[PDB]
């Protein structure tokens with residue numbers, strides 16, 4: 001019963017989340033885990049939130065999904081200093097996502113239908 005966009009986004013989310021085996025990005029980061037996080041990060045984002053939005057038909061374009069994904073990675077690159085696992089992983093995932101979900105690839109996908 002799922003729509004074309006939900007099926008695609010779900011694919012993108014699964015592929016990107018594969019790159020986070022430890023589950024750092026799976027659920028909202030808490031201050032208990034990451035002290036002061038909420039003083040640095042105004043607009044938190046995580047994979048679980050994104051998945052809920054997919055399921056709930058809240059994304060009306062792939063561009064909207066990309067904005068949340070980029071927000072999640074940006075947040076990690078903002079809270080964490082460059083020499084940390086979290087900043088490094090966020091950079092890698094962002095780069096992969098940006099290529100996988102490029103405007104040219106999305107145009108090809110749309111045209112194929």
Ligand SMILES: Cc1nnc2c3ccccc3c(-c3ccc(N4CCOCC4)c(NS(=O)(=O)c4ccccc4Cl)c3)nn12
Nearest residue numbers: 022023024025026029032033034035075076079080086087
């Ligand atoms: C995403 C992201 N961006 N910055 C961070 C960050 C910065 C400092 C410390 C931790 C993080 C984490 C992070 C988020 C979740 C987790 N867990 C993954 C497995 O399920 C339990 C929760 C971890 N794991 S953890 O590295 O083992 C950890 C570190 C500090 C305190 C507690 C923990 Cl559990 C780390 N994720 N994160």
